[PDB]
Design an enzyme around this catalytic site. Structure first.
Site, PDB file in Angstrom:
ATOM      1  N   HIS A 188       2.201  -8.243  -4.130  1.00 14.89           N
ATOM      2  CA  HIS A 188       1.472  -8.713  -2.976  1.00 14.89           C
ATOM      3  C   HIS A 188       1.503 -10.238  -2.755  1.00 14.89           C
ATOM      4  CE1 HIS A 188      -0.706  -4.943  -1.844  1.00 14.89           C
ATOM      5  NE2 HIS A 188      -0.444  -4.629  -3.088  1.00 14.89           N
TER       6      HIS A 188
ATOM      7  N   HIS B 228     -11.715   0.226  -6.379  1.00 18.96           N
ATOM      8  CA  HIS B 228     -10.776  -0.760  -6.930  1.00 18.96           C
ATOM      9  C   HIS B 228     -11.426  -1.607  -8.018  1.00 18.96           C
ATOM     10  CE1 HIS B 228      -7.301  -3.460  -6.852  1.00 18.96           C
ATOM     11  NE2 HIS B 228      -8.166  -4.486  -6.921  1.00 18.96           N
TER      12      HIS B 228
ATOM     13  N   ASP C 174      -4.209   0.332 -10.688  1.00 21.13           N
ATOM     14  CA  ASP C 174      -4.648  -1.087 -10.711  1.00 21.13           C
ATOM     15  C   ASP C 174      -4.165  -1.837 -11.949  1.00 21.13           C
ATOM     16  OD1 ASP C 174      -7.972  -0.508  -9.141  1.00 21.13           O
ATOM     17  OD2 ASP C 174      -5.908  -0.747  -8.280  1.00 21.13           O
TER      18      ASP C 174
ATOM     19  N   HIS D 132      -3.398   2.485  -3.023  1.00 18.75           N
ATOM     20  CA  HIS D 132      -3.300   2.409  -4.467  1.00 18.75           C
ATOM     21  C   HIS D 132      -3.422   3.829  -5.027  1.00 18.75           C
ATOM     22  CE1 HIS D 132      -5.020  -2.013  -4.557  1.00 18.75           C
ATOM     23  NE2 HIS D 132      -3.989  -1.912  -3.712  1.00 18.75           N
TER      24      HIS D 132
ATOM     25  N   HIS E  39      -8.852   2.098  -9.875  1.00 18.21           N
ATOM     26  CA  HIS E  39      -7.805   3.080  -9.551  1.00 18.21           C
ATOM     27  C   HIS E  39      -6.807   3.205 -10.702  1.00 18.21           C
ATOM     28  CE1 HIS E  39      -8.563   1.413  -5.213  1.00 18.21           C
ATOM     29  NE2 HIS E  39      -9.307   2.489  -5.423  1.00 18.21           N
TER      30      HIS E  39
ATOM     31  N   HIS F 151       1.313   2.346  -6.064  1.00 20.93           N
ATOM     32  CA  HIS F 151       0.881   3.023  -4.854  1.00 20.93           C
ATOM     33  C   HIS F 151       1.305   4.468  -4.860  1.00 20.93           C
ATOM     34  CE1 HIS F 151      -0.387  -0.632  -2.312  1.00 20.93           C
ATOM     35  NE2 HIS F 151      -0.120  -1.143  -3.500  1.00 20.93           N
TER      36      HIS F 151
ATOM     37  N   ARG G  41       2.248  -6.791   1.642  1.00 21.01           N
ATOM     38  CA  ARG G  41       3.170  -6.234   0.627  1.00 21.01           C
ATOM     39  C   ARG G  41       4.492  -6.990   0.731  1.00 21.01           C
ATOM     40  NH1 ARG G  41       1.401   0.289   1.140  1.00 21.01           N
ATOM     41  NH2 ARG G  41      -0.824  -0.293   1.247  1.00 21.01           N
TER      42      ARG G  41
ATOM     43  N   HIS H  15       0.380  -3.380  -8.176  1.00 25.42           N
ATOM     44  CA  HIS H  15      -0.207  -2.053  -8.328  1.00 25.42           C
ATOM     45  C   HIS H  15       0.832  -0.931  -8.119  1.00 25.42           C
ATOM     46  CE1 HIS H  15      -2.782  -4.601  -5.617  1.00 25.42           C
ATOM     47  NE2 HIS H  15      -3.501  -4.711  -6.742  1.00 25.42           N
TER      48      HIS H  15
END
Ligand SMILES: [Cu+2]
Ligand SMILES: [Zn+2]
Length: 151
Positions: free
Chosen positions: A118, A69, A81, A61, A78, A46, A141, A44
């Site tokens: 992630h 989400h 995403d 996000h 988002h 951020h 992360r 994603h």
């Protein structure tokens, strides 16, 4: 800007190079990530391009429209995403995404923000619990970088 780039780094073995190119009203995302456990990993944009505390200082996000989400194909998602990348048995994921919501200019611009990969798969908001609707249950992360203007 019509082109951007991001170099992903972390405290473990994950690293990668992501390329972005504007095409029509879309952004084409290409590149690779290495050093991953086999299978899917959440991916994603951020909100903040702030690496003073590693990946933690990137914030949540990227979400300028104040939605829950989802996966990239969902209306309710988002802006940041981008779903999952998938790593092979050798730990390599090839990235190949076309997205209509992120942009390299204007209000939905991701230049100066952060890309994050992630620990776990992103459940696309369908996990049947509350965390699913915030982070997709993607967990910690592993690596990140600031998205920069490219030649
Ligand atoms: Cu993320
Ligand atoms: Zn999200």
């Amino acid at each position: 800007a019509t082109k951007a780039v991001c170099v992903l780094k972390g405290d473990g073995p994950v690293q990668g190079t992501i390329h972005f190119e504007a095409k029509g009203d879309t952004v084409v995302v290409t590149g690779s990530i290495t050093g991953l456990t086999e299978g899917d990993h959440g991916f994603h944009v951020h909100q903040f391009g702030d690496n003073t505390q590693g990946c933690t200082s990137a914030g949540p996000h990227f979400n300028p429209l104040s939605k829950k989400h989802g996966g990239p194909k969902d209306e309710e998602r988002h802006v940041g995403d981008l779903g999952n990348v998938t790593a092979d048995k050798n730990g390599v994921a090839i990235v190949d995404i076309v997205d209509p919501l992120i942009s390299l200019s204007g209000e939905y611009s991701i230049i100066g923000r952060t890309m994050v990969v992630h620990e776990k798969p992103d459940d696309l908001g369908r996990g049947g619990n509350e965390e699913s609707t915030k982070t997709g249950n993607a967990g910690s992360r592993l690596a990140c970088g600031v998205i920069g203007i490219a030649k």
